[PDB]
From Swiss-Prot:
Protein name per UniProt: YTH domain-containing protein 1
Organism listed in the record: Homo sapiens (Human)
Binding site for RNA: 18-20, 34-35, 85, 133
Post-translational modification, as annotated: Tyrosine phosphorylated.
Outcome when changing residue 37 to T: Reduced binding to N6-methyladenosine (m6A)-containing RNAs
Substitution effect: residue 132 to D: Does not affect ability to influence alternative splice site selection
Outcome of swapping residue 132 to F: Reduced binding affinity for N6-methyladenosine (m6A)-containing RNAs by 9-fold
Impact when changing residue 104 to D: Does not affect ability to influence alternative splice site selection
Coverage span on the entire protein: 345 to 507 of 727
Length: 164
């Protein structure tokens, strides 16, 4: 069902997370972590303190889909086990901010064709699939986008609820 999911999404904030490759999203799914550049790190840290849930929605560039969405369980922290990210052409490992811990809520894909009716007021009402890495998605658009994903029966939101 969707009731616990809607409860997790109640009054949450949403952010569009864009990755250049599937490998980083796969590491994120396996290890429950995400790392980004400081300009986004700062935004995500602010949002984590401000809202009951901060939801990251992942899309791999050029894939035409979203790959799932997760909930921030921590602010960024430095000095863990180094994560073997596949870094973009210009970027090195010292250029990243800290590591966020995330709980996946859905590891299933959603094709852009299914979200074409969803516009993001915080990006000029362009379709929600359009946006830079870190773009915030307005509450109602983000909520309906998460509800479009196929249910992930591998995930039990009982555990995530207990962290809010
Ligand atoms: O957020 C960024 O722009 C950088 C990438 C590196 C690992 C995953 N995020």
């Amino acid at each position: 069902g969707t009731s616990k999911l809607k409860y997790v999404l109640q009054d949450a904030r949403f952010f569009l997370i864009k990755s250049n490759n599937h490998e980083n999203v796969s590491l994120a799914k396996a290890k429950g972590v995400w790392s980004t550049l400081p300009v986004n790190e700062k935004k995500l840290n602010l949002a984590f303190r401000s809202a009951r849930s901060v939801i990251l929605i992942f899309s791999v560039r050029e894939s035409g889909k979203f790959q799932g969405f997760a909930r921030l369980s921590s602010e960024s922290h430095h000095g863990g086990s180094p994560i073997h990210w596949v870094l973009p052409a210009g970027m090195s490992a010292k250029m990243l901010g800290g590591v966020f811990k995330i709980d996946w809520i859905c590891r299933r894909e959603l094709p852009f064709t299914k979200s074409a009716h969803l516009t993001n007021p915080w990006n000029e009402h362009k379709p929600v699939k359009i946006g830079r890495d870190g773009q915030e998605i307005e509450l109602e658009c983000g909520t309906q986008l998460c509800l479009l994903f196929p249910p992930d029966e591998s995930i039990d939101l009982y555990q995530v609820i207990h962290k809010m």
